[PDB]
C-alpha cells in the first residue's frame, strides 16, 4: 500500500484532467482532501520518506487558496509531530463533505467501482463523505467561492434546521419571548429607549445616494499596541484594549467619566429622590479617561453592555473580566479557558455573554455564574469571533478553520455551518433584520450569508488585506467594511439582498463593482472598529501606526 | 538536594512557617496497578522496593500539594478589620447594600404606579363596570395595612409577656495551586476542574 | 510586625529602581499602583535577588574580582537551579 | 551568519515577510536552549543505560520525554464534545426580576472592602 | 482497584493543619491527581527500563523520572 500512493493519486489526477470541462471543474474538488488524507496516513503509519516524496510530487497542483494548510503539512513529517497538533488530528478522524452533483458523481463512480482503482476508492469511502445534489454542475468560479475550509463545504442536512432568525417585540420567524429567559426591561432601561427614538428621528436614510459621513477616532500615540475597540450603542463611550494589559475608557461626549460615591457618602443621602443617580455621582473623580488594570496579558476583546455599565474584556491570560462603569473597578474574573480568549461580546439584551478562545470552544456565560451555561465545541481551530444574533437566541462563531457556525443557545446545537472563506474569519456582523450575516476574513472577502436558507447570498471582494471590522447601518441600507489596507469601504446592503432550493447553492452574481458605494483610505491607520451612530453616522477607531 | 542554595528549598521552609503563623498507598492494589501498565511496554515483573517507592513518591507529590493549598486556604481567613494597622480603601459591597435598599424602594414605587394605573382604569364618581379594580383592590390595600399592624403587635405582645478558626479548602484553592505550577497548568484535569 | 514596620518606613525611602519603571512592569501584569511603599518593597526584593546572584558570581571570580563573565554566572546560578545559556549563535 | 540565515528562511517558508530584527536572535536562543536540554537529558539517559557513547536511541528517548512535558496542546475534539453535551443538557435558569446588579456569589467576585496600610 | 483509601489522605491534611477540612470535590480531585501521577510516573519509568533493556522496573528507573521531570529527589 504505502509505496504506491503516488500511483493511486496520479491515476485519479489523470482521470479528472482528462474529463470533459463541465465535470472537470467539479471533480477537481477531491484533489485537496485526497492529498491530505493520503499524506497524513503516511506520516501516521511512520512512512516518512514516502510521505515527503508524495508531498513534493503533488503539493503544487493544489489550489492556491490552500497554501497555509500546505505549509503546516510540509512541517509535519513525523508521527509525534502530528500527535500534538490537534487540528490535523481532528482532520484525520472527520470526513470531508465534498458536495458534488449527480451528473459528475456518475463519472466518478464509474471510475471507482471497478477493481482497477479499488484502493483510491477505498480511501474515498473511508475518509470522504460525498453529499450529492441533483442539478447543474457548478462552475469553477462558483466552486472557488464556497470551498476553502478544512473538512469543508458541509452537508445540506446541517443547513436545513429551523432557525428563528426574526426579531423580538407578527413575525413567523421570530422566537417567543420565553424561549430564552431574557432579563426584564427596567424603568431606567425603558428610559434609554425613549431617548433612543429621539436619535432615530434625526436618522438619515443612507442608500446609494446619501453616503454617510465617517468620523475617524484615531488613537494617536498608542505605542502600547491597541488590540480591542468597542463603542457603546449611543456614541458616548469608546473603550480601548491595549497590549500593555490595560483597558481605557474614553468619553467622547462633553461629559466626563465619573465614578459613583463611596458607601459612606451614599449612606448619608436618601433614596426615593428623583435625582438619585445625579446625587450619587462623585465629582471628585471626573476624567476624560479611565484606565482599568487587572489583566495579565494583552486585552483582545472589548464589549460594552447596552445599559452603558458593565464593560467586558478578554485577554491572553485566559480570563474574561467584567468591569463596572459606575465604580470603574473589576467585578468578576471568568476563568474557563486556560488559553487566550480572542473575543467576547455581551448579548444585545445585556445578561448573557459569549467568549471564544484558543481552546477551540466558545462559552456562554450569564454574569451570575462562575461557570458557563453553554459550551459551543464543534470548531477545529481557534474561535476567533463570537457574535450574538439581534434576538440573542443564536450565537455566530467564526473561526480559524475557515468556517462560520451558528449555535442555538438552547441545546447548544450547531444549526448552520457557513464555509467558503480562505483565511481565518476576523469579523462577523448581523443584519438588523436578522436575516443576513456578513463575515470577513484574511482573504479580503466579505461573504454575505442567508440564515434561514443557510446559503451565501453575495461575495464582496474589494478589500486587499484582512477585513477586521464589519457593520451594517441602523436601517440596514449600507454595510461598512474596514480592513488592514487602511480603507473603509461602503457596500450597498439593499441591492445585495434583492432576491430571497435543494441544490443548496445560488448562482452568486460577481457584482462587487456595482455594490461599492465608496472606498475611503485612512492615513496609515488600520480600521479596527466600525460603528454606526443612531443618526446613521459612521464611527471608526484605529491606532495610527506610521510603519 | 542537588542544589545547595535551591530556590524551592526556601519556598516550602517559609511556607510551613506561614501556615504555622496561620498518603502511604496500599501495597496490594498498587502492585497490580504497576503491572498492568507494564504489559504495554514489556516490564513483566517489578522490583520489590519499587511499589513502596512509588507510594513514597505519591505521598511527596500530594503533601507538596496539600501544603500548597493550605497556605492559600488560610489566605482568605485573614480578617483585616479586626486589626487597626490597616485602613479600608474601597468597599464595593456596602455600595451593594445601598443598591439592595434602592431596589426595595423601586419595587415599592412600581407597586404604587400599578395601584395608580388600576385606579385610572375606571375613574368616575361611582365604580365603573369591569375596570372598577379601585373598589375591591383598594379595600384589599387597607386589609394589607391592617396585616402589617400584626407584624408590629406580635413584636409588642411578646415584649409585654417578657416584662479556633476552622479552615475549609474549596475547589478554588486547588485550582489556584494548579495553574501556577508548570505541570497541570495546561492539562485536562485543570480544564475539567473549571466546570466542576 | 517587622515587615509591616519596614513598609511603613518605606515612605521617604528612594530605591535603586525608580517607581516609574518598577510600576511600569507591575502595570504590565495587572498590579496597579495603589500604594508607593508596596511598589518600593517589590523593587527592593528584585534588587536583592539580582545583588545576591552578583555577589555569588563575584566570589566565583575572586576564586578563579573585576570583569563578570558568563562563566561566572554559570556556577553562580547553578546552586539556584538555573542553567544559564551561552549565546553561541552570533 | 550561518545559523541566522537559515532562521530567515524558516520564517519566509512560513510566509512571514515582515518581522523585527530581534525575532531571529531569540528563536536561535530558544533553539539553542532546546538542544542543550535534549542532549543534557540524553547523556543522563545514556549513563542510566551505561554506555559511553550517546547514540540515537538516547536522543529518541530524550525528545519524547521532553515533548511529553514541555509542548502541550489544547484539549482534543472528543474531550470538548463530551464536556459540551454534559453542559448543554442543563436548561437555562430563569432570572429574578429586580435582584439588582446581577453578579456571582461574593466569593467568586472581586468586590471586597480592599484594605490598605495606615500611613504613619 | 483504588490505591488511595480517602482516609489516609485526611491524615495527610491533619499532619499539616490539625484544624482543616477539605471539601468532597477537593478530595476527589486530589485522588484523581494521585492516580494520574502514578500512571505518568510508571509509564515513563517503564520507557527508561525498556531503554536499559530490562524487564525489571527497578527504582533507579522510577528515581530518574522524578529527578528529571518532577524534581522530587525522594531518598531511595
Curated annotation (Swiss-Prot), chain A:
A GO cellular-component term linked to this record: transcription factor TFIID complex
Domain comment quoted from the record: Distinct domains of TAF5/TAFII100 are required for functional interaction with transcription factor TFIIFB (RAP30) and incorporation into the TFIID complex.
Similarity comment: Belongs to the WD repeat TAF5 family.
Keyword Transcription: yes
The keyword Iron-sulfur is annotated on this UniProt entry: no
Name this protein carries in UniProt: Transcription initiation factor TFIID subunit 5
Record's subunit section: Homodimer. Component of the TFIID basal transcription factor complex, composed of TATA-box-binding protein TBP, and a number of TBP-associated factors (TAFs), including TAF1, TAF2, TAF3, TAF4, TAF5, TAF6, TAF7, TAF8, TAF9, TAF10, TAF11, TAF12 and TAF13. The TFIID complex structure can be divided into 3 modules TFIID-A, TFIID-B, and TFIID-C. TAF5 forms the TFIID-A module together with TAF3 and TBP, and in TFIID-B with TAF8. Component of the TFTC-HAT complex, at least composed of TAF5L, TAF6L, TADA3L, SUPT3H/SPT3, TAF2, TAF4, TAF5, GCN5L2/GCN5, TAF10 and TRRAP.
MF GO annotations: identical protein binding; RNA polymerase II general transcription initiation factor activity
Key words, A-Z: Host-virus interaction, Nucleus, Repeat, Transcription, Transcription regulation, WD repeat
Start and end residues of each stretch annotated as NTD2: 1-131
Residue ranges of WD repeats: 221-260, 294-333, 336-377, 378-419, 420-459, 462-500
Subcellular location: Nucleus
Swiss-Prot record, chain C:
GO biological process, one term: transcription initiation at RNA polymerase II promoter
Extent of the signal sequence: none
MF (Gene Ontology): DNA binding; enzyme binding; identical protein binding; nuclear estrogen receptor binding; promoter-specific chromatin binding; RNA polymerase binding; RNA polymerase II general transcription initiation factor activity
Keywords, alphabetical: Acetylation, Methylation, Nucleus, Phosphoprotein, Transcription, Transcription regulation
CC terms in the record's Gene Ontology section: cytoplasm; male germ cell nucleus; nucleoplasm; nucleus; perinuclear region of cytoplasm; SAGA complex; transcription factor TFIID complex; transcription factor TFTC complex
Location in the cell: Nucleus
Modification note: Allysine formation by LOXL2 results in release of TAF10 from promoters, leading to inhibition of TFIID-dependent transcription.
Subunit structure: Component of the TFIID basal transcription factor complex, composed of TATA-box-binding protein TBP, and a number of TBP-associated factors (TAFs), including TAF1, TAF2, TAF3, TAF4, TAF5, TAF6, TAF7, TAF8, TAF9, TAF10, TAF11, TAF12 and TAF13. Component of the TATA-binding protein-free TAF complex (TFTC), the PCAF histone acetylase complex and the STAGA transcription coactivator-HAT complex. The PCAF complex consists at least of TADA2L/ADA2, TADA3L/ADA3, SUPT3H, TAF5L TAF6L, TAF9, TAF10, TAF12 and TRRAP.
Family: Belongs to the TAF10 family.
Species of provenance: Homo sapiens (Human)
Encoding gene (name): TAF10
Swiss-Prot record, chain D:
Highest taxon listed in the record's lineage: Eukaryota
The entry's DNA-binding region: 108-120
Induction of expression: 6 to 8-fold by apoptotic signals.
Subcellular location: Nucleus
Subunit structure, as described in the record: Component of the TFIID basal transcription factor complex, composed of TATA-box-binding protein TBP, and a number of TBP-associated factors (TAFs), including TAF1, TAF2, TAF3, TAF4, TAF5, TAF6, TAF7, TAF8, TAF9, TAF10, TAF11, TAF12 and TAF13. Component of the TATA-binding protein-free TAF complex (TFTC), the PCAF histone acetylase complex and the STAGA transcription coactivator-HAT complex. The PCAF complex consists at least of TADA2L/ADA2, SUPT3H/SPT3, TADA3L/ADA3, TAF5L/PAF65-beta, TAF6L/PAF65-alpha, TAF10/TAFII30, TAF12/TAFII20, TAF9/TAFII31 and TRRAP.
Family per record: Belongs to the TAF9 family.
UniProt function note: The TFIID basal transcription factor complex plays a major role in the initiation of RNA polymerase II (Pol II)-dependent transcription. TFIID recognizes and binds promoters with or without a TATA box via its subunit TBP, a TATA-box-binding protein, and promotes assembly of the pre-initiation complex (PIC). The TFIID complex consists of TBP and TBP-associated factors (TAFs), including TAF1, TAF2, TAF3, TAF4, TAF5, TAF6, TAF7, TAF8, TAF9, TAF10, TAF11, TAF12 and TAF13.
Protein's name in the database: Transcription initiation factor TFIID subunit 9
Biological source species: Homo sapiens
Encoding gene (name): TAF9
Boundaries of the shown chain within the full protein: 13 to 132 of 264
UniProtKB/Swiss-Prot annotation, chain E:
Superkingdom of the organism of origin: Eukaryota
Subcellular location: Nucleus
Free-text tissue specificity from the UniProt record: Ubiquitous.
Its biological purpose: The TFIID basal transcription factor complex plays a major role in the initiation of RNA polymerase II (Pol II)-dependent transcription. TFIID recognizes and binds promoters with or without a TATA box via its subunit TBP, a TATA-box-binding protein, and promotes assembly of the pre-initiation complex (PIC). The TFIID complex consists of TBP and TBP-associated factors (TAFs), including TAF1, TAF2, TAF3, TAF4, TAF5, TAF6, TAF7, TAF8, TAF9, TAF10, TAF11, TAF12 and TAF13.
Family affiliation: Belongs to the TAF12 family.
Subunit comment: Component of the TFIID basal transcription factor complex, composed of TATA-box-binding protein TBP, and a number of TBP-associated factors (TAFs), including TAF1, TAF2, TAF3, TAF4, TAF5, TAF6, TAF7, TAF8, TAF9, TAF10, TAF11, TAF12 and TAF13. Component of the TATA-binding protein-free TAF complex (TFTC), the PCAF histone acetylase complex and the STAGA transcription coactivator-HAT complex. Component of the PCAF complex, at least composed of TADA2L/ADA2, TADA3L/ADA3, TAF5L/PAF65-beta, SUPT3H, TAF6L, TAF9, TAF10, TAF12 and TRRAP.
Protein name: Transcription initiation factor TFIID subunit 12
Organism: Homo sapiens
Residues included from the entire protein: 55 to 130 of 161
Amino acid at each position: 500500500d504505502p509505496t504506491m500512493y503516488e500511483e493511486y493519486y496520479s491515476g485519479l489526477k489523470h482521470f479528472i484532467e482528462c474529463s470533459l470541462d463541465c465535470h472537470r471543474a467539479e471533480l477537481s474538488q477531491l484533489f485537496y482532501p485526497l492529498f491530505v488524507h493520503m499524506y497524513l496516513e503516511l506520516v501516521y503509519n511512520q512512512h516518512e520518506n514516502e510521505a515527503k516524496s508524495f508531498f513534493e510530487k503533488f503539493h503544487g497542483d493544489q489550489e492556491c487558496y490552500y497554501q497555509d494548510d500546505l505549509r503546516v503539512l510540509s512541517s509535519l513529517t513525523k508521527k509525534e509531530h502530528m500527535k500534538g497538533n490537534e487540528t490535523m488530528l481532528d482532520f484525520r478522524t472527520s470526513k470531508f463533505v465534498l458536495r458534488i452533483s449527480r451528473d459528475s458523481y456518475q463519472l466518478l463512480k464509474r471510475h471507482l467501482q471497478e477493481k482497477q482503482n479499488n484502493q483510491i476508492w477505498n480511501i474515498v469511502q473511508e475518509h470522504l463523505y460525498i453529499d450529492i445534489f441533483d442539478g447543474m454542475p457548478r462552475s469553477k468560479q462558483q466552486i472557488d467561492a464556497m470551498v476553502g475550509s478544512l473538512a469543508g463545504e458541509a452537508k445540506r442536512e446541517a443547513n436545513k434546521s429551523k432557525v428563528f432568525f426574526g426579531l423580538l417585540k407578527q413575525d413567523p420567524n421570530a422566537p417567543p419571548q420565553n424561549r430564552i429567559p431574557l432579563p426584564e426591561l427596567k424603568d431606567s432601561d425603558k428610559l434609554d429607549k425613549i431617548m433612543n427614538m429621539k436619535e432615530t428621528t434625526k436618522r438619515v436614510r443612507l442608500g446609494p445616494d446619501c453616503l454617510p459621513s465617517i468620523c475617524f477616532y484615531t488613537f494617536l500615540n498608542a505605542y502600547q499596541g491597541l488590540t480591542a475597540v468597542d463603542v457603546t450603542d449611543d456614541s458616548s463611550l469608546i473603550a480601548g484594549g491595549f497590549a500593555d494589559s490595560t483597558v481605557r475608557v474614553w468619553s467622547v461626549t462633553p461629559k466626563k467619566l465619573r465614578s459613583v460615591k463611596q458607601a459612606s457618602d451614599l449612606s448619608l443621602i436618601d433614596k426615593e429622590s428623583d435625582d438619585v443617580l445625579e446625587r450619587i455621582m462623585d465629582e471628585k473623580t471626573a476624567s476624560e479617561l479611565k484606565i482599568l488594570y487587572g489583566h495579565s496579558g494583552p486585552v483582545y476583546g472589548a464589549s460594552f453592555s447596552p445599559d452603558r455599565n458593565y464593560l467586558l474584556s478578554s485577554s491572553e491570560d485566559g480570563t474574561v473580566r467584567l468591569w463596572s462603569l459606575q465604580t470603574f473597578t473589576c467585578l468578576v474574573g471568568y476563568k474557563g479557558h486556560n488559553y487566550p480568549v480572542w473575543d467576547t461580546q455581551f448579548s444585545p439584551y445585556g445578561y448573557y455573554f459569549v467568549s471564544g478562545g484558543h481552546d477551540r470552544v466558545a462559552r456562554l456565560w450569564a454574569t451570575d455564574h462562575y461557570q458557563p451555561l453553554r459550551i459551543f465545541a464543534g470548531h477545529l481551530a481557534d474561535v476567533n469571533c463570537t457574535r450574538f444574533h439581534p434576538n440573542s437566541n443564536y450565537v455566530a462563531t467564526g473561526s480559524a478553520d475557515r468556517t462560520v457556525r451558528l449555535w442555538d443557545v438552547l441545546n447548544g446545537n450547531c444549526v448552520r455551518i457557513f464555509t467558503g472563506h480562505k483565511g481565518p474569519i476576523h469579523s462577523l456582523t448581523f443584519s438588523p433584520n436578522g436575516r443576513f450575516l456578513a463575515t470577513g476574513a484574511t482573504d479580503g472577502r466579505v461573504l454575505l450569508w442567508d440564515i434561514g436558507h443557510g446559503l451565501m447570498v453575495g461575495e464582496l471582494k474589494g478589500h486587499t488585506d484582512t477585513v477586521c471590522s464589519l457593520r451594517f447601518s441602523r436601517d440596514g441600507e449600507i454595510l461598512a467594511s474596514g480592513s488592514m489596507d487602511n480603507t473603509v469601504r461602503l457596500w450597498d446592503a439593499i441591492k445585495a439582498f434583492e432576491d430571497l432550493t435543494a441544490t443548496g447553492h445560488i448562482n452568486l452574481p460577481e457584482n462587487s463593482q456595482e455594490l461599492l458605494l465608496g472606498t475611503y483610505m485612512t492615513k496609515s491607520t488600520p480600521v479596527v472598529h466600525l460603528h454606526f451612530t443612531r443618526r446613521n453616522l459612521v464611527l471608526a477607531a484605529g491606532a495610527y501606526s506610521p510603519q | 538536594v542537588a542544589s545547595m542554595a535551591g530556590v524551592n528549598l526556601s519556598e516550602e521552609s517559609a511556607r510551613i512557617l506561614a501556615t504555622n503563623s496561620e498518603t502511604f498507598l496500599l501495597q496490594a492494589p498498587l502492585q497490580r496497578r504497576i503491572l498492568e501498565i507494564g504489559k504495554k511496554h514489556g516490564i513483566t515483573e517489578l522490583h520489590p522496593d519499587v511499589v513502596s517507592y512509588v507510594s513514597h513518591a505519591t505521598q511527596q507529590r500530594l503533601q507538596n500539594l496539600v501544603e500548597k493549598i493550605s497556605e492559600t486556604a488560610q489566605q482568605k481567613n485573614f480578617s483585616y478589620k479586626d486589626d487597626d494597622r490597616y485602613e479600608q480603601a474601597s468597599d464595593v459591597r456596602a455600595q451593594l447594600k445601598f443598591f439592595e435598599q434602592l431596589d426595595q424602594i423601586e419595587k415599592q414605587r412600581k407597586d404604587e404606579q400599578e395601584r395608580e394605573i388600576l385606579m385610572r382604569a375606571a375613574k368616575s364618581r361611582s365604580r365603573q363596570e369591569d375596570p372598577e379594580q379601585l373598589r375591591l383592590k383598594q379595600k384589599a390595600k387597607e386589609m394589607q395595612q391592617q396585616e402589617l399592624a400584626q407584624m408590629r403587635q406580635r413584636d409588642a405582645n411578646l415584649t409585654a409577656l417578657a416584662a479556633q478558626r476552622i479552615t475549609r479548602v474549596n475547589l478554588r484553592d486547588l485550582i489556584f495551586c494548579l495553574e501556577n505550577e508548570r505541570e497541570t497548568s495546561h492539562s485536562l484535569l485543570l480544564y475539567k476542574a473549571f466546570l466542576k | 510586625t517587622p515587615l509591616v514596620d519596614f513598609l511603613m518606613q518605606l515612605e521617604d525611602y528612594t530605591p535603586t529602581i525608580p517607581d516609574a519603571v518598577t510600576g511600569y512592569y507591575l502595570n504590565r501584569a495587572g498590579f496597579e499602583a495603589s500604594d508607593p511603599r508596596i511598589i518600593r518593597l517589590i523593587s527592593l526584593a528584585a534588587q536583592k535577588f539580582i545583588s545576591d546572584i552578583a555577589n555569588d558570581a563575584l566570589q566565583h571570580c575572586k576564586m578563579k574580582k573585576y570583569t563578570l563573565t558568563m562563566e561566572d554566572l554559570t556556577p553562580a546560578l547553578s546552586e539556584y537551579g538555573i542553567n544559564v545559556k551561552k549565546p553561541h549563535y552570533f | 551568519p550561518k545559523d541566522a540565515q537559515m532562521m530567515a528562511q524558516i520564517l519566509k517558508d512560513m510566509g512571514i515577510t515582515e518581522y523585527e530584527p530581534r525575532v531571529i536572535n531569540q528563536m536561535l536562543e530558544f533553539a539553542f536552549r532546546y538542544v542543550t536540554t535534549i542532549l543534557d537529558d540524553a547523556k543522563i539517559y545514556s549513563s542510566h543505560a551505561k554506555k559511553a557513547t550517546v547514540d540515537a536511541d538516547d536522543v529518541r528517548l530524550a525528545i519524547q520525554c521532553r515533548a511529553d512535558q514541555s509542548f502541550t496542546s489544547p484539549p482534543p475534539r472528543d474531550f470538548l464534545l463530551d464536556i459540551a453535551r454534559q453542559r448543554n443538557q442543563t436548561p437555562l435558569p430563569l432570572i429574578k426580576p429586580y435582584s439588582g446588579p446581577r453578579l456571582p456569589p461574593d466569593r467568586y467576585c472581586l468586590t471586597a472592602p480592599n484594605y490598605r496600610l495606615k500611613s504613619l | 482497584n483504588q490505591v488511595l483509601t480517602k482516609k489516609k489522605l485526611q491524615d495527610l491534611v491533619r499532619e499539616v493543619d490539625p484544624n482543616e477540612q477539605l471539601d468532597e470535590d477537593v478530595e476527589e480531585m486530589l485522588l484523581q491527581i494521585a492516580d494520574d501521577f502514578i500512571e505518568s510516573v510508571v509509564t515513563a519509568a517503564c520507557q527508561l527500563a525498556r531503554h536499559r533493556k530490562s524487564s525489571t522496573l527497578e527504582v533507579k528507573d522510577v528515581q530518574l523520572h522524578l529527578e528529571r521531570q518532577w524534581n522530587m529527589w525522594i531518598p531511595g
